[model samples]
Target: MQHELQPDSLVDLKFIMADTGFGKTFIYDRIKSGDLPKAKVIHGRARWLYRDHCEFKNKLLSRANG
Candidate 1:
């Protein structure tokens, strides 16, 4: 079975962690520290844009390849 991200959907912290393999604390902390974009409250829940997450990954890749 293959589990791929939608890439352009609204996701929650749980999905992000599943995709990144990171712990809850780390992801939440990064959001507060400004390393990651803050979640948008939609329908009374916190959701993140997958595009923003993609951009964040790209930013890291650019630095490493620079």
Candidate 2:
């Protein structure tokens, strides 16, 4: 079965895994510190919803543009 994320929900912990530069612990720490939104935990892991993903993407895009 597929799991649907809530609106404006935080991002998944696994999402950061795609980047090669940072480690999981670093990402986890950031999330824990409120640098990132607090996400729902699944099987002991955190996840972000679609809205949060879009927000984060836009932020990244804006940063890149600058």
Candidate 3:
């Protein structure tokens, strides 16, 4: 995580999905199933946040380290 991340910063679903190598349907499906963080509906599209994305990535391996 960076020290200068903005809570107001926005990212497209593509950037988020790139890390997982999944399609938008997979991304949306997870969000829909409550498996991932719900997206923020803005700019007439669904967007995610920098902070939350890091948290999500960490959560995947979080239990392994615990």
Candidate 4:
């Protein structure tokens, strides 16, 4: 029953797969490739800002050919 709902600010690793429609491995690969920004570490946990996600999505959308 998970709608297309998204968090307002910080999100975790699995969030990327559901939000971006990419697999966990693919997302991790992009992270390692430097295509995506690194997540911030908090309390020994990794989290990414929603703003960074937006920026990444924008870049991909902007580069898409019509």
**Which one wins on TM-score?**
4
Question: With candidate 2 superimposed using the best TM-score fit, by how many Å does residue 5's alpha carbon deviate from the native?
Answer: 11
Which candidate do you rate higher for TM-score, 2 or 4? Answer: 4
Give candidate 2's TM-score: 0.40
How much does each candidate deviate from the true structure in C-alpha RMSD? 4.4, 5.5, 5.4, 4.5
lDDT of each: 0.63, 0.51, 0.57, 0.61
| Model 3, residue 17: C-alpha shift (Å) | 1.6
Clash pairs (backbone) in predicted model 3: none
Q: What is the lDDT of candidate 1?
A: 0.63
Q: Least lDDT summed over 10 consecutive residues: which range in candidate 1?
A: 29-38
lDDT of residue 49 for candidate 2: 49
Off by over 4 Å in 4: 1-8, 28-38, 42-45
Put the candidates in lDDT order, highest first: 1, 4, 3, 2
Candidate 1 vs 3: which has more TM-score? 1
- The full ranking of all candidates by TM-score, starting with the best, is 4, 1, 3, 2
Residue-by-residue lDDT tens digits, candidate 2, 1-66:
244546565545555555324566755554454335445666767555445444544555556632
Model 2 local distance difference test score: 0.51
Global lDDT of model 3: 0.57
- Candidate closer to the true structure by TM-score (higher is better), 2 or 3: 3
- TM-score, cand. 3 vs. native: 0.48
